């Protein structure tokens, strides 16, 4: 909700004043009024650039503005990549080069000034809206541009389509001011939504496998979406308290999304990755809503909300304990999996036994279990005869909670030390007590490293030596160390009483 410009300031930011002062007037010869719509290509840039190459790129940008302005609107469905090709050229240049951003905006203000055709003016406003959704003008133009938007919205004799685009452009500029910069050029899907002044649809998978459909905009961060999912799911409304976040998943490989990262930036990365493929492998992308942080901040305990969060965590933990990077203990896996089968299908029958091969894989037992321990699984399952769904679930929850990896943030790591007393393949299990070094081959905790000793990721051990931990997701490890350290700092502040 922060205003870029107050209504009282509109009259103090006339574009004509900005243009008279900053336009490259000496290098712009031409018969046509340089300040307003023209059909022909500009001979030089509208603004002054120090690099002659950027002046050239600015002239090229104007041709693409014309190309988009003049394109058949109904080509957008036929070949969307071709329709958005001039848009992506413009947005790529502007996002990469900050000194070229004001030039882009001025070209769009110019082409929407005294435009004689409403259909062409509608296209320029689509372009303004795509630009606003990508990068803002610099501080030297942003208030003149915000005045131009407000004048268009409140005064200008323009179409409803232009007023809607101008309103949505002002809103997204405000949204970005609050949420910070983006890193990627919008995908075709995002551009399609922006063009029509509508939200972006994203599908989030919960830990229980269920799907939640969500509407976001270009500026939507992981934190905002995590708070929205939390609130909708009837959990504690603040993801900073409940510890959940949205992660990115590609072919089962999970990557952390930072709290200020834009979900639409993950979509552009996906769009590129799914195209660069050109049919060689599967391209299974998912957003997943999972518990990342484990704070012992359960006070007025809203038990209802807490129970919803724990139910999601039990699915996540059970699935992590069926993953060989974390757990290789078959007797433990048989114990939790047989109770889950008892909870879902009740007492053993020979029909359940015939159904289990293939079907139960990754659900009630692992690959190693169906392989070498099917009768041991069945024998354990038969021992649960007479347990109600409630009692089998109670027993499964106790077994999950008793595991050393329960209520820990899990990180798969490797080390190259020829002297350190840890297996080369280890797990960092981060919780409120420390950075725990865990051996998934033996199911044993090896060491609890203090957050206080902390300044690939270099971890300072008790003996003051350094463990250089290599991982596929450094951002996750770094953020976990920072979040638990901040939580411990906040608890020390609350404990101090003058
Ligand atoms: N602050 C803007 C515009 C100043 C004006 O319009 O006087 C610039 O110098 O880039």
Strand order of the largest sheet: 2-1-5-3-4
Task: Please tally the helical runs, counting DSSP H or I stretches of 4 or more residues.
Answer: 20
| Structural class computed from helices and strand pairing | alpha+beta
What small molecules are bound in this structure?
glutamic acid
Estimate the strand proportion.
Answer: 5-15%
Could you describe the 3D structure shown?
The PDB classes it as motor protein. Keywords: Myosin, motor protein, myosin tail, MyTH4-FERM. The protein is of the alpha+beta class and 498 residues long. It folds into four domains: 1-198, no CATH class; 199-327, no CATH class; 328-403, no CATH class; 404-497, no CATH class. The protein is built from 20 helices and eleven strands. The chain has helices spanning 15-22, 52-70, 75-78, 80-83, 85-96, 101-111, 118-132, 142-154, 160-179, 188-195, 222-232, 239-242, 263-277, 303-320, 330-345, 350-359, 367-372, 374-382, 389-401, 474-495; strands at residues 200-206, 211-216, 244-250, 253-255, 285-291, 409-414, 425-431, 434-439, 444-449, 457-460, 466-469. Strands 2-1-5-3-4 form a five-stranded mixed sheet, with helices on both faces. A four-stranded antiparallel sheet has the order 6-7-8-9, covered by helices on one side. Helix 8 runs antiparallel to helix 9. The protein is elongated, with a radius of gyration of 29 Å. The structure holds glutamic acid. Glutamic acid (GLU) binds at residues 17-18, 21-22, 140.
